Amino acid sequence: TRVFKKASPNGKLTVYLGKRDFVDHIDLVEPVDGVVLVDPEYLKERRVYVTLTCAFRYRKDLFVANVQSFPPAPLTRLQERLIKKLGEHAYPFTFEIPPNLPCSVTLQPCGVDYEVKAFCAEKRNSVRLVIRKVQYAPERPGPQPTAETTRQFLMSDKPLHLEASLDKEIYYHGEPISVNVHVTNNTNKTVKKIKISVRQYADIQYKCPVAMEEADDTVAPSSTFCKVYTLTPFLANNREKRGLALDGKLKHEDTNLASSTLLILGIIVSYKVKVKLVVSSDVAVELPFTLMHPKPK
């Protein structure tokens, strides 16, 4: 259908690739396959090498694989058609990335990125195309996140039963998260304020609050409380935060908040919902959830 192409500065080496988003399946990875077109006359090194690199910019390299496109030492269903259309002067190359390697991620002004390069070695003879490693969301949900505590003080002789829960663990990007909060204060202190937040843990560590919701609800002594909140973490209010873990982007396009890291070097990203009660000595509770992208169907 479509094939992204990038011609080398001399126009002899023209890299062609079917896609540029290689999805890191949990068990395996998609094969990075392409074809390099060469002009035998221009080919003075008699050797063209294609590499698939995974850099951790800030340089560090985590996976370098070399395959000799020419001279010959199989072909994917797309490679054969591409060669047939482009003639007989094009030679195919393929890489099979192994699991346990990171997925593309950037830091909002870096991170782990991938690249496919081709060069004739025995500037003009060097063509580089940027690709991305990314992952979908788990196809099935996990157990409901429920978290309860009981914080007591010396003055009071009864528990302050705090509890929180989410409606599910898999929350796609741009989806509101409902945070069911319950309190039961048999103590004497006044429950001044309530806070709910969605926060990111990105370990290369830092913790930026992506979503916040502060309520002045007050629970009088010896009383219950139940309330459903709603937070939507998106990038509209997260553009002045340096160091935020953004998903990987090809050149400069705006992208969404980094997905979860389904499970290793690189940067590991996960998200947690926190419910906090500021009392007149503030109680807290946390739960995990999965922020990712769906799978087209």
């Epitope: 796609y172 990007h173 741009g174 989806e175 998106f234 990038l235 509209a236 992208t255 969404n256 087209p296």
Partner: antibody, heavy 129, light 108 residues
Framework: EVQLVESGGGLVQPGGSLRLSCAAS????????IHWVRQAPGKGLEWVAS????????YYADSVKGRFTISADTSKNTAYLQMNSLRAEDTAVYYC??????????????????????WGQGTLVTVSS | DIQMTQSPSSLSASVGDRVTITCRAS??????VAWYQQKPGKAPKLLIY???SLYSGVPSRFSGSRSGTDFTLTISSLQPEDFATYYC?????????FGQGTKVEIKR
């Protein structure tokens, strides 16, 4: 299925104000672009404004830049067009449309601004003293 | 802005006539041209997007073509329900601009 419902159309004197509400069902207002369009009596379609909630982007035509504002409420899953300083020329029928940011293959296509595939029903706005 | 000049401003055709309508962008649009059909009073319906890509549910007679800035909407065999106002829209830059409609009338 996806649906959009427009509301907030009626008479208003020149220099007045209205507020059109577009309620979205079957999808999320954050994963899409939302557009306000209008067609005058005996004329053709005209694009008014557009919003993206997730990235916080707002665009307006040159004829409604300042007199109109567009915003979104993701808690209720709705979009609002606040129409100020209305005039007789604004008398028209207003439509709400949306463009999914999905279908790239993995994630968001944040620059397509593509075709508006789902439309509401159109609400008439009048302006006359 | 980008001015989308459309032609004919109106045309008369019978049943089975192989109608054809042309839109032309004042600037280099890149296959971001959508074709809609509005019947009297009702709301527009998307018919073509990306300047060549048919939309789900739209009949097969409608077709889109690109030859540069010159976009073409063709109907293989006009049918009674293909009597409305057809618009072209560039969804590449902002502000989005429509055409001028083309009332496909009847011939007598």
């Amino acid at each position: 299925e996806v649906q959009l419902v427009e509301s907030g159309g009626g008479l208003v004197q020149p220099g007045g104000s209205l507020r059109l509400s577009c309620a979205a069902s079957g999808f999320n207002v954050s994963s899409s672009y939302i557009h306000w369009v209008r067609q005058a009596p005996g004329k053709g379609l005209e694009w008014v404004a557009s919003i993206s909630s997730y990235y916080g982007y707002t665009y307006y035509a040159d004829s409604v830049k300042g007199r109109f504002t567009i915003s979104a409420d993701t808690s209720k899953n709705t979009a609002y067009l606040q129409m100020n300083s209305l005039r007789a020329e604004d008398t028209a029928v207003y439509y709400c449309a949306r463009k999914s940011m999905y279908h790239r293959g993995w994630g968001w296509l944040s620059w397509v601004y593509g075709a508006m595939d789902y439309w509401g029903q159109g609400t008439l706005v009048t302006v006359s003293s | 802005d980008i001015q989308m000049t459309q032609s004919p401003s109106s045309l008369s055709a019978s049943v089975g006539d192989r109608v054809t309508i042309t839109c032309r962008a004042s600037q280099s649009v890149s296959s971001a041209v959508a074709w809609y059909q509005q019947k009297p009073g009702k709301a527009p319906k998307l018919l073509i997007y990306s300047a060549s890509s048919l939309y789900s549910g739209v009949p097969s007679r409608f077709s889109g073509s690109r030859s540069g800035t010159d976009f073409t909407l063709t109907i293989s065999s006009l049918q009674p329900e293909d009597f409305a106002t057809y618009y072209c829209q560039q969804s590449y830059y902002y502000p989005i601009t429509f055409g001028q409609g083309t009332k496909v009338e009847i011939k007598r």
